[PDB]
Design a protein around this ligand. Structure first.
Ligand SMILES: O=c1ccn([C@H]2C[C@H](O)[C@@H](COP(=O)(O)O)O2)c(=O)[nH]1
Ligand SMILES: O=c1ccn([C@H]2C[C@H](O)[C@@H](COP(=O)(O)O)O2)c(=O)[nH]1
Lengths: 264, 264
């Protein structure tokens, strides 16, 4: 993806050496913004094969407010195994904050529903936000939310969304983070009878791990292919009624996948 | 300011018509990022005279976790009068969330102190964040926080900060929002024995009110003057011990002030 490869080069050319949690060094930049016109095509990286399968299950898992990996396991999705405790619990992460943000007075706020209500009744609102950054529950989470905060925006019948990502592994995580939110935008837009607009990605500490240099150079030598198209087979009655089989991506012809190891 | 005037032109050239809360129309863009190297000078708009006096008092007021306008009044600062109730209370706004974010279990989190601790003990952290977006208390606030979320970053002994502003009145509010956080960066940096780095401003719904066109065109015709320098007369023992008289801006030679009316 043109915008993506440009970020990779930027991290290489301008990133400063910075170490992560008792481990691998990284090349790091702070503050970056990218824009994807969703009307131009689904922003799924083509310079390396990316599998949407786990992304879709993860998103549907987030929407159900589920915080135990059982659902992911019923579908053989193991991306959260690394963090789940013996019982399969991850703590009050994403799904829990999105659907049941606990208040000091005993309530549980459903931010997804609130946002649906706003887009349908007050589209011009500058307060259509979903936050997963719950300060009071951070100590209980398996890990602090990376995509911590996102805001919606409506203009000319088009729904845009801006995500603020505090930390970002450009090589391994970013291709997935973009596809995940771009999917959510299509789902929201469908439910609110709006066209898709832009997906604006904003990152904090954007980096490349030192042991991923060869993979980065390899990917950078590749030429981006046309973006595929996302197809939603049917329109569910609510944002909580989507099923894995409802989505299909058409015209995705990527370059070979590239593995990237992580230190432990 | 070069980056500022460029944003104004952008809103004019590319902004779409969008109305605000039962009132004035605006020219609006969604998603914008600006960077200010604080080493180049204090980012205080020179194309129109801006008064720092109220900005400083407001910041010191935020730091004390104060949420009643009494302190502002002792100093004849009336920027919050519009929202204060009969008693002078604004609800659990900025100051309250920064210094005493209430948890469901009865605790009150001091995010300013937590952030100081991190910059001093874990500078490489990608989780040095302060959020004022407390979902559970939004209904009690005089207004939902505009500068809702900011993150710190340390690299090569330089402290950078990125602010996410959900809504932004480019003409009236932005010059002030930038100076406010740029001051905070200098204060934090001083307390942690670090040099100042960049101030990255990220905005959501960035706009210009329709009844401010003449003022915008007037300002756009002006040429930016050199940036002033911020001087901190002394180093307090803590971030909570700063006083109005501790700051002085040197070399500020702006163009005449420009008034901008608001509809009611
Ligand atoms: O959605 C996600 C989750 C994690 N990461 C990456 C960011 C960092 O490389 C590491 C998390 O480290 P900390 O930010 O907590 O330090 O995993 C992503 O890129 N995207
Ligand atoms: O720090 C601030 C606070 C407010 N505003 C502006 C943004 C909007 O123009 C209006 C607030 O409206 P809502 O975002 O709630 O709709 O005041 C700013 O520019 N900066």
């Amino acid at each position: 993806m043109k915008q993506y490869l440009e970020l990779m080069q930027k991290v290489l050319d301008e990133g400063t050496q910075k170490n992560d949690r008792t481990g691998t060094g990284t090349l790091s930049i702070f503050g970056h913004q990218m824009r994807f016109n969703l009307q131009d095509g689904f922003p799924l990286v083509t310079t390396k094969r990316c599998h949407l399968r786990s992304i879709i299950h993860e998103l549907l898992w987030f929407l159900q407010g589920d915080t135990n990996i059982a659902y992911l396991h019923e579908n053989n999705v193991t991306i959260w195994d690394e963090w789940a405790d013996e019982n399969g619990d991850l703590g009050p992460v994403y799904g829990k904050q999105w659907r049941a943000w606990p208040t000091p007075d005993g309530r549980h706020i459903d931010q997804i529903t609130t946002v649906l209500n706003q887009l349908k009744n007050d589209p011009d609102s500058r307060r259509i936000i979903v936050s997963a950054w719950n300060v009071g529950e951070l100590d209980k989470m398996a890990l602090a939310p990376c995509h911590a905060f996102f805001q919606f925006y409506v203009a000319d019948g088009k729904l845009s969304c801006q995500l603020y990502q505090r930390s970002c592994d450009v090589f391994l995580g970013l291709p997935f983070n973009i596809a995940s939110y771009a999917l959510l935008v299509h789902m929201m837009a469908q439910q609110c009878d709006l066209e898709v607009g832009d997906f604006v990605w904003t990152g904090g500490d954007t980096h490349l791990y030192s042991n991923h240099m060869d993979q980065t150079h390899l990917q950078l030598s590749r030429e981006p292919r046309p973006l595929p198209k996302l197809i939603i087979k049917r329109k569910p009655e609510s944002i909580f009624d989507y099923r894995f089989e409802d989505f299909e991506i058409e015209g995705y012809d990527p370059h070979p996948g590239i593995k990237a190891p992580v230190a432990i």
